[PDB]
Amino acid sequence: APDAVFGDRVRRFQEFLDTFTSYRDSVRSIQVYNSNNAANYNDDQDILPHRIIISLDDLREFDRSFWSGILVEPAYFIPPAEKALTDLADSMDHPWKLSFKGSFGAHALSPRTLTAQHLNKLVSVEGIVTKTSLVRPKLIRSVHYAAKTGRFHYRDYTDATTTLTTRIPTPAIYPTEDTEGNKLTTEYGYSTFIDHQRITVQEMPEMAPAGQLPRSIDVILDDDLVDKTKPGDRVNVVGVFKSLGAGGMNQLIGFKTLILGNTVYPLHARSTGVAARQMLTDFDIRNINKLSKKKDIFDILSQSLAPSIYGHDHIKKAILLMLMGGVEKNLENGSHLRGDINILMVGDPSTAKSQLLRFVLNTASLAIATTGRGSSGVGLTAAVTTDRETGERRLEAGAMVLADRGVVCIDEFDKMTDVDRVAIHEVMEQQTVTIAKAGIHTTLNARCSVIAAANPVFGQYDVNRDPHQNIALPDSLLSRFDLLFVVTDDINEIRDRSISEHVLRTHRVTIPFLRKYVQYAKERVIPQLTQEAINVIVKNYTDLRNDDNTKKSPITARTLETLIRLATAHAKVRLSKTVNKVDAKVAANLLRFALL
Amino acid sequence: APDAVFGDRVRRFQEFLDTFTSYRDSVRSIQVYNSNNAANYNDDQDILPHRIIISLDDLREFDRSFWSGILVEPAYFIPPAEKALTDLADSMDHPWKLSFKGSFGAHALSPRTLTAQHLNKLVSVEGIVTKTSLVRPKLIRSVHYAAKTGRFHYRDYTDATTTLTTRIPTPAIYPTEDTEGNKLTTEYGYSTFIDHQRITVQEMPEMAPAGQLPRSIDVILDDDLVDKTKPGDRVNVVGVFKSLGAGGMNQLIGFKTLILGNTVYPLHARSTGVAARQMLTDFDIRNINKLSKKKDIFDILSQSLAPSIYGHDHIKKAILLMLMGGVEKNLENGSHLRGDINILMVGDPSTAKSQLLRFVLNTASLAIATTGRGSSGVGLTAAVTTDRETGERRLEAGAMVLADRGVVCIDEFDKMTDVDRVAIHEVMEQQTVTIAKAGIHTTLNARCSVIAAANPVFGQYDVNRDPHQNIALPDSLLSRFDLLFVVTDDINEIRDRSISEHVLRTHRVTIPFLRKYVQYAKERVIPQLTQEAINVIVKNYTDLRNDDNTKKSPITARTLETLIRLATAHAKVRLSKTVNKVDAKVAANLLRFALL
Amino acid sequence: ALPSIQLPVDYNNLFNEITDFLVTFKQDKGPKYMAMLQKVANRELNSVIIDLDDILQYQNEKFLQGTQADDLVSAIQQNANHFTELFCRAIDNNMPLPTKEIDYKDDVLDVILNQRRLRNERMLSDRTNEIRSENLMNDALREVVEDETELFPPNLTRRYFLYFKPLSQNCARRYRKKAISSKPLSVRQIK
DNA sequence: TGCATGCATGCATGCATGCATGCATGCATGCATGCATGCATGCATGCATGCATGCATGCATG
DNA sequence: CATGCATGCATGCATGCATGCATGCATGCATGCATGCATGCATGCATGCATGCATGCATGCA
Ligand SMILES: Nc1ncnc2c1ncn2[C@@H]1O[C@H](COP(=O)(O)OP(=O)(O)O)[C@@H](O)[C@H]1O
Ligand SMILES: Nc1ncnc2c1ncn2[C@@H]1O[C@H](COP(=O)(O)OP(=O)(O)O)[C@@H](O)[C@H]1O
C-alpha cells in the first residue's frame, strides 16, 4: 500500500492532468490509431510507442513547488506522475513514458564542466555523437516447460538501470530442476525481450576552446530509443545524471557515472544532418497555393537569390533547378537513370565567385563544403577500424558518402590532384562508390549534386587567346559537367554605375519563406513527359549537332539527357503535373547563354 | 500475480460455494447483525468474529479429489478457499476463517499413538485440558511519529506460526532514527494487537490403559479462540499437525511439533462440565406447550423416575423439585437468600439406596459423585502451585468449587470425619468458601445442591429403639438438611407380590424428552408469591410449632424458609407465573410424610 | 522502504486550543488553574489534577457560542500517552514565577532548581554580550544566541506532577459523549 | 452382672530440612575468505626506408 | 633569339615489423566471526517431627 506522500504527488499532478485538455486528445489519438493499426492488419489479411511530449512551460504557472522538486530531485516526482498517467490511459479506455521537453537556463551547461556538480539532477546536454556501439537485446522474462507435469512457469529478472531508485538487489540463478526433479526444458518466443544500447557523446567543437583534450561521458538508451543517431551528428540529450556502483569502499576511484531516463533530439548543424523538420501550416500552404497561381514567379525567384550581388541573371536560374534535382526513374531490372544536375563556373577573381558559395551552402539542405585537397576519405571511408571488441573491419562514412540526397561544395577545383579525380568519374556517373580493400570489398550509394569552381590557368585571359584550353582539364570532365559558365571582366561606366549605388546602399519573398516552398515540392511535384515535349527538342537537338560543332565542341547524347532534366526541373517550379512546351522554351534558351 | 493452480482451487470451490445456498444466508446474517450491532451503539448513544461452520459432508458428494487433497496436504487448499470466501464476503456486501466440522474415521486417533505418522496432515484429537497458560497479546503493527516532519509511518511484523507455508524469514529491527535523524517517537493505541495462548492436552483417562506414563502434545490458539477452556475438561480439538523448527542440523533431537489452524469443541463428560447444549425446536416446545396444559402431569413425572424401582412415591416428588432449584432473590445491599434444597435419606440396605444415586447423577446436569473421604481439596483448592514461570500462588478448583449451579452426590455420609464437616456448615448455609492460607486469603462462590446418604449406627434398628439418635450426628446438621426420609423394611406378601413380577419382567414420556423439559424451565419460569400464599402457611406453621414439638424436634424458622422453596419449585413444574394456593397444598403434604 | 500514513489526528491546532482552555476558564475569583498554578508557584503542592468534565463543559460552550471546536475528549481517550508531556510543556509558558520569596526551610529540592533556573539565565546573559560587541530586529540577534549554547533541558527542572481524572457519567447523562472510559470493567473483560 | 465415662495409644495431616533438576550466559577455539603479485595472453600503434612525382638543365628545333 | 623534349636529381607517403599496455587464471598469506561449553543461579519434590482425633481398655455405679 502506498503512503500519503505518493498519492499526493499523484492527485496534484492529476489536478494538472485534468487542468489542460490538450494532452487528453494526444493520448486519445495514440490509442485510436494503434487500434486502427491493428484493425487493418487483422481484417483484410484473413508500431508507435507510448510516450507523450510534456513541455516545461505550464509547471511554473501551476505549481512552483512541483517545478522546483523536479529540477533538483527528480527521483521522487517522475514515478508517481507516470503512474498517474498510466491511470489516465486505463481510465479513458506498459510504461507510458514522457519527454520533458522545454528550454531552461538552469542546467543547459557544457558536458566539459559537468562533473562533480549537480549530481542526481536532470541535465540537458548537447554535443557530438561518436563511436556508436552495437545493438543488443536484453533478457527479462524466462519461460520454462516441465515435461511430466506438463505446465509452464514464470520467472523475471531486473537490473538497477531501469528502476531509478536504489532497491535491495536480489539476484536469482537461472532455474534448473525446480521442485521434485522434472527437467526444466527451456522455451523461447513467449519469453520477452527488450533492446538496449550505450553510446558516448563528445562535446561541441564550435563551443570548444582552441586546443585541449576533449572529455566525454556516456548515455545508455531504452527500448523505443535504440538507434536514432549515426556517429557524427549534433544531438541534444535531455535526461537525469545518475551515479551508480559501489565507489571502491568494498574492500583507486569508483563512482563512474552515466545518464538515464533520456530523450534524444537531433539538431541541425551548419554542414551535417537533416534540416527538413520545418513545419507547414494550412496558412503556409494557402500562401503557396496563392503564389503558384501566377505566371512570372520564376523571374522573382531568380532575382531573389542575389541579395547583395549585381547581375548574373541566367546563372541564378539554374541554382533553382539544381535544388529541384530533376526526376528519377529507375528502370525495371536495368539501371537507374541519373536525374540531378552538376555545374562548374569559371571567371576572373573578385567577381562574386566566393560570394556565391556559402549562399549555396546555407540556403540548401545537407551540404558539405569541400576545400582544397580531398585526400583519403572524402570520396572514401578508408575502413580503418581497430575495434577492441573483436577483430573486424567497419567503415567511417566520408563526406561524399555523407552528402547523399544533397549538395557537395567543391572549392578551388583546379588544385585537386588526379588521384581523387578517378573517383569523380565513378561518383558523378554511376552514382555508386565501391571500395575493395583486402578486408572487405564493398559497394554503396551516393547520388550527390556537385558544384565546383576552377580558375583559369594563367592571368585573367578568359577571352583573349582561345576558348579552348583556358582550363586544361581532362576530356571526360568536360562531359561530366552540364553547364560551364564564363564570367567576364567587362569594364564600363553604366555597368560601374550599377556597381556603385549597389555597394553603397549595401552597408546601410524572403529566405525563410523560400525553403518552405522548396522542400514542399519534392514529395508531391514530380511531372511526366507529354507529346508536346518531343516535337521541339527533336528539331532542336539536330541543330545542336549540325551547327554547334561548326563553332564549339563537344556534342554527346549525354547532352540530350540534360535537356530532359531542364524541362523537368522547370515543371517542378510551376508545380504542374504534365510537361508543357514552354518548359522546353525555357530549357532551349538556357543552353544558348551557357555556351554561345 | 497468481498462477493457474491457485485460481483453479478458487473457481472449483467457488463452484461449490455457488452450489449450496445454505452458507450464503449464514454470512448474510453475520453481516446484518454486526451492522445492526454497530447501528444501535452509534445512534442512541449521542463482537462476533468472522468464521462459518462448514461440514465435512458435502465435499465427498461434490469432489472426491478435493476431498482427498485436504485430508492429506491441507497446506494447498485451505488458503485459496478462504481467499474465495473473502471474495464472497466482499461481493455480497479480515481473515474470515472456517471450522471444518465433520466426523471422519480416517484420523480420529489417540494422541498417545499420534507421533511420527501423519505429519503435515489434519488430525482430530480429543482429551483432557490441563495446565492452562497465561493470556498474552501479540505485537503486529508498530506506529511511529516523527517530530519535525510531523507525519506518521508504517511497519509490520510477522511470524511463522500464522502463515502455514514456509516462507523466507525476513526479520526487521524495531525502528529508530529512520531517514535523516528525526527521533521516531513511539505511539500506541492505533498500533494493532491480537491475543495469543498456548495449552497442553492430556489424553482421555477412560481411553487410557491401566497404568502407564501419559504423554501429551501442545496446541497454540488464535484471536477469537483464546480462553474457551478451563483446565480439567474434555474437549475435542480439530486442527493441522505441523512441525516447525530447524531439527538440529544447523551446527540431540530437534523437530518439536504442535498443532495450529484449530477449532475447539468442549464435550460432555460423565461428571464434568456443561451438558446444556441440547437444542429445542419449535416442534419440541409445541409438545411442551401441549404437555403443560394438563392437570396431573406432576404424577406422571413422579412415576416416571422409578424405571426399575418399586414404590417410594413421595421420595421421587422432591427429586423433581431439587432440579427445579427454587427461586433466588438477592437482597438490595444485604445478603442473598438461599434457594436450593438439600435432602438426606436413610434406610436399611438393599432397599434401592444405591439404586437411586447414579440415576440422580446421569439424568441431571453438572453432577460430581463424592465418595468416602473428601479430604484436602474437595471443599478446598489447597493452593499448591510451584509454578516455574514465577513464584506465585494459584488455585486448582476442587469438586465443591467445580459443582457450582449443580448437584453434589455424597456417598456413605456417616464415614466422613469431622474435619470436612466444618466446611459443610460453611458451604450449605453461606453458599461461599473462603480459603485463608499464608500465601493469599481468598473468597469464592459455590451454591451447590447436596444429597447425602448415611446408614443407621447398628443393625437395621430403624423403628425399634427410638427415632432419636439412630444416626448420632451433630445437632446443626439436622438443621442443615431439609427432608429426612426413612425407608422401612416392611415384610408382606402383597408387597412381596409387587416386588415379584417387577423384577421378573425387568430382565426381559421418556428420559431424553425429560431433560429438554427441565432445562427450558430454568430461564423463563421463575414465579412470584401472591396474597393467597400467605394465609394458609401462616395458619399451618403455627401448628408446626405448637403440636409437632409434642411429637418430634426441632422447629426453626429455617424450616419456614423451606416451605417457601417447596411452593416455589412446584410452580416451576406447572410453568405458572403467579403462585397458587394448590402449590401450598402440595407443599403442606410433603412435610407430613417426611416427618410423621 | 518505511512508508508513511496520514490520519485525522492533529498535533498543531490541538496544541493551540489546549493553550486557550488552560488559560480561559472562569466558571469554577479569577482563572481557576492559574490560581492553582500560582499555588504551584507558591511551592506548596506537587500534584496537578485534570478532569474531563470542564473540557466537555468547554466543548459544550464553544459550539454554542462560536463556530467550531476540535474534539478533545475522545482525542485524549484514544492514545493518552502523548498527551502527558505535550500538555505539560504548555503549562510552563505562563507562570507567576516570583510570587513568593523563597523560604530558608522550604525544600532542599527547591534550592537546586532555583540554581538551574538562574544558571540558565546567567549563561544566557553572557552570549548576548559577545555577539552585540562584534556586529557584522534583535529577534535574529536573539535567535543566534538560541542555538550556540548548550543548556539544561526544561524537562529536567519541573518539581511538580500531573495526574488525569476520568469523567463521571453524571455530566455524560446530560449530554451523551464518549463516556466509554468509565465503566466497571473486569480483568476478564480486558481484551 | 451390664453399662457409661475417663485414660492410654496408634494415625496420618501440616511445618522444617535435604537434595536433585532446569535455565541464563560470557569466553576461547577453529575455519571461511579477501587480498597482494606476477603471468600467459590478446590486440592497438609508432616508424623508417625506397619509389613515383615535380622541377631544373642540356640539347634540339624553327 | 624564342619553345619543346629527354635526362637527371630531390623528396613525401604506405605498411609490415618490434614493443608497450588491458582482462582472466593461479597461488601464497593474514584478519575476522559464528559458536559449544564451564559456571552460576533459581525452583520443585520428599521425609522426620508435633499432634488432634478416633479407638480400645480399665474403672465404678444401679
Ligand atoms: N556583381 C557584384 N556585385 C556585388 N559585389 C560583387 C560583385 N562582384 C564581386 N563582388 C565582390 O567580390 C567579392 C567576392 O570575390 P570572389 O569573386 O567571390 O572571390 P574569388 O574570385 O577569389 O573566388 C565580394 O566581397 C563582393 O563584394
Ligand atoms: N423397591 C425395589 N424395587 C426394585 N429393586 C429394588 C427395590 N429395593 C431394592 N432393590 C434392589 O436393591 C439393589 C440396590 O441396593 P441398595 O439398597 O441401593 O444398596 P445400599 O443399601 O447398600 O445403598 C438393586 O440391585 C435393586 O435391584
Side-chain angles (χ1 to χ4, degrees), chain B residues 246-547:
Chain B
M249 292 180 183
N250 194 2
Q251 183 65 260
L252 293 174
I253 301 98
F255 296 113
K256 60 182 180 293
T257 61
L258 47 90
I259 294 170
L260 287 174
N262 299 320
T263 53
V264 173
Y265 295 99
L267 57 94
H268 188 208
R270 180 67 179 272
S271 296
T272 299
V274 182
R277 293 192 300 273
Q278 193 176 8
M279 65 185 73
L280 292 174
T281 71
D282 296 332
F283 183 78
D284 289 333
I285 191 168
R286 185 182 62 83
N287 298 319
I288 289 171
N289 289 115
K290 186 172 70 68
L291 185 143
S292 64
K293 289 182 184 293
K294 292 177 70 176
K295 64 185 288 184
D296 203 73
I297 56 173
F298 181 75
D299 194 4
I300 305 166
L301 293 175
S302 297
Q303 295 179 356
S304 65
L305 300 180
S308 64
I309 301 166
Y310 181 73
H312 305 286
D313 291 333
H314 298 169
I315 298 171
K316 297 293 188 291
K317 296 180 183 292
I319 306 168
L320 280 80
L321 301 176
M322 188 189 74
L323 296 177
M324 295 298 169
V327 72
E328 178 68 29
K329 297 187 294 296
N330 191 358
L331 288 176
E332 192 272 330
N333 65 17
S335 177
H336 68 280
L337 273 75
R338 185 185 62 194
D340 56 358
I341 295 95
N342 296 319
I343 304 99
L344 183 138
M345 295 172 63
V346 69
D348 294 333
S350 71
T351 321
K353 52 173 66 173
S354 299
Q355 191 67 43
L356 184 60
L357 303 174
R358 303 291 182 88
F359 182 78
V360 177
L361 190 144
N362 291 317
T363 56
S365 183
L366 282 80
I368 294 171
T370 63
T371 60
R373 67 178 63 88
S375 178
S376 297
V378 170
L380 279 76
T381 59
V384 181
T385 61
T386 312
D387 299 331
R388 297 177 186 176
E389 64 273 15
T390 181
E392 68 181 2
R393 300 298 178 90
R394 295 182 296 171
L395 303 179
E396 293 181 354
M400 190 62 68
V401 182
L402 192 62
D404 196 2
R405 296 290 183 182
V407 182
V408 177
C409 294
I410 295 172
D411 295 335
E412 297 292 327
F413 182 73
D414 53 355
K415 301 296 185 292
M416 183 63 74
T417 65
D418 54 354
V419 176
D420 202 1
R421 295 175 188 270
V422 177
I424 305 302
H425 293 169
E426 175 65 29
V427 170
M428 291 183 67
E429 189 176 2
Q430 299 178 180
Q431 310 304 103
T432 55
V433 171
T434 66
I435 300 169
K437 200 183 286 184
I440 292 96
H441 63 88
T442 60
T443 295
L444 60 94
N445 291 318
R447 52 184 294 161
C448 309
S449 65
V450 174
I451 293 175
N455 298 115
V457 177
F458 58 97
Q460 66 176 358
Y461 290 163
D462 201 1
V463 76
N464 195 1
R465 180 63 63 194
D466 53 353
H468 177 66
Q469 285 171 355
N470 302 118
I471 301 98
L473 75 159
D475 197 2
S476 295
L477 294 174
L478 285 81
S479 66
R480 295 295 185 273
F481 291 152
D482 297 329
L483 297 180
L484 296 176
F485 289 162
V486 175
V487 177
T488 62
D489 194 75
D490 196 359
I491 47 100
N492 290 115
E493 297 86 2
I494 298 97
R495 182 69 180 269
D496 194 8
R497 182 67 60 85
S498 64
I499 297 301
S500 67
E501 288 93 9
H502 192 191
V503 186
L504 291 174
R505 74 187 70 189
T506 301
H507 293 102
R508 292 178 68 249
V509 185
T510 67
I511 297 170
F513 178 71
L514 184 143
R515 59 177 60 87
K516 288 185 287 293
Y517 181 77
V518 173
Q519 72 175 358
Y520 173 71
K522 293 177 72 173
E523 74 274 11
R524 302 179 181 179
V525 201
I526 55 84
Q528 289 81 19
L529 184 143
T530 63
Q531 184 179 1
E532 296 293 327
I534 290 98
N535 301 114
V536 177
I537 63 171
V538 170
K539 179 180 67 65
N540 197 1
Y541 189 78
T542 57
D543 196 1
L544 297 175
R545 301 188 65 86
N546 292 133
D547 294 331

Side-chain angles (χ1 to χ4, degrees), chain B residues 536-537 540 563 566 583-593:
Chain B
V536 177
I537 63 171
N540 197 1
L563 297 178
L566 267 64
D583 300 331
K585 298 290 180 67
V586 176
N589 198 3
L590 290 172
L591 192 146
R592 297 294 184 273
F593 185 78

Side-chain angles (χ1 to χ4, degrees), chain C residues 35-87:
Chain C
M36 185 189 74
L37 200 151
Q38 188 175 3
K39 179 65 170 63
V40 172
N42 202 4
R43 296 173 289 112
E44 294 174 352
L45 183 60
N46 294 319
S47 67
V48 173
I49 306 301
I50 302 301
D51 63 345
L52 298 172
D53 291 332
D54 291 331
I55 300 168
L56 190 146
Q57 184 177 1
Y58 178 73
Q59 189 169 359
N60 290 321
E61 186 176 2
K62 182 60 69 178
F63 177 72
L64 269 296
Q65 296 304 111
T67 63
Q68 185 61 256
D70 294 333
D71 181 75
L72 197 142
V73 174
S74 177
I76 296 174
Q77 193 278 309
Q78 294 296 322
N79 202 357
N81 197 3
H82 196 197
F83 292 95
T84 65
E85 296 178 353
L86 191 145
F87 175 72

Side-chain angles (χ1 to χ4, degrees), chain C residues 28-176 179-182:
Chain C
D28 293 331
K29 290 173 69 176
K32 179 184 176 67
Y33 298 102
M34 285 183 180
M36 185 189 74
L37 200 151
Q38 188 175 3
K39 179 65 170 63
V40 172
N42 202 4
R43 296 173 289 112
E44 294 174 352
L45 183 60
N46 294 319
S47 67
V48 173
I49 306 301
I50 302 301
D51 63 345
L52 298 172
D53 291 332
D54 291 331
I55 300 168
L56 190 146
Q57 184 177 1
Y58 178 73
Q59 189 169 359
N60 290 321
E61 186 176 2
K62 182 60 69 178
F63 177 72
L64 269 296
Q65 296 304 111
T67 63
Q68 185 61 256
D70 294 333
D71 181 75
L72 197 142
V73 174
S74 177
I76 296 174
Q77 193 278 309
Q78 294 296 322
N79 202 357
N81 197 3
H82 196 197
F83 292 95
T84 65
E85 296 178 353
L86 191 145
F87 175 72
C88 187
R89 62 181 292 273
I91 295 169
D92 205 4
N93 290 321
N94 43 0
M95 183 181 289
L97 180 60
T99 186
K100 184 172 287 295
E101 185 181 1
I102 52 96
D103 190 73
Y104 196 82
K105 295 181 284 187
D106 185 77
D107 191 358
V108 72
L109 181 64
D110 197 5
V111 68
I112 298 169
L113 274 76
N114 197 0
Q115 293 178 356
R116 291 172 178 170
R117 194 268 313 280
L118 188 145
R119 184 67 179 89
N120 194 3
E121 294 294 324
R122 185 179 181 272
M123 188 183 287
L124 195 277
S125 177
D126 193 4
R127 189 63 56 84
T128 185
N129 195 2
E130 294 292 328
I131 298 169
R132 186 173 289 171
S133 70
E134 299 298 325
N135 291 318
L136 280 76
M137 294 182 286
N138 288 319
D139 195 1
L141 187 145
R142 181 183 62 84
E143 193 272 331
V144 173
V145 186
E146 298 292 328
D147 298 332
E148 292 178 352
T149 303
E150 290 178 350
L151 298 178
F152 291 96
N155 198 6
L156 192 143
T157 58
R158 301 285 286 271
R159 195 182 179 272
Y160 67 97
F161 292 100
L162 191 148
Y163 293 158
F164 291 96
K165 183 176 180 180
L167 59 91
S168 175
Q169 59 89 31
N170 194 2
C171 186
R173 183 177 180 269
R174 184 67 57 83
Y175 293 101
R176 180 64 166 85
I180 61 172
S181 290
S182 177

Side-chain angles (χ1 to χ4, degrees), chain A residues 375-407:
Chain A
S375 178
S376 297
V378 170
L380 279 76
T381 59
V384 181
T385 61
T386 312
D387 299 331
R388 297 177 186 176
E389 64 273 15
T390 181
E392 68 181 2
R393 300 298 178 90
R394 295 182 296 171
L395 303 179
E396 293 181 354
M400 190 62 68
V401 182
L402 191 62
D404 196 2
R405 296 290 183 182
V407 182

